[PDB]
Write a protein that binds this ligand. Structure first.
Ligand SMILES: [Zn+2]
Length: 29
């Protein structure tokens, strides 16, 4: 429900958003 899991998006390498949420690199995010 609240989904509280700090994650370092592998996309660019930032923490606070999953790959799909990381709109930096174009690849599932
Ligand atoms: Zn990121």
């Amino acid at each position: 429900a609240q989904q509280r899991k700090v994650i370092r998006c592998w996309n660019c390498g930032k923490e606070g958003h999953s790959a799909r949420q990381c709109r930096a690199p174009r690849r599932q995010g």
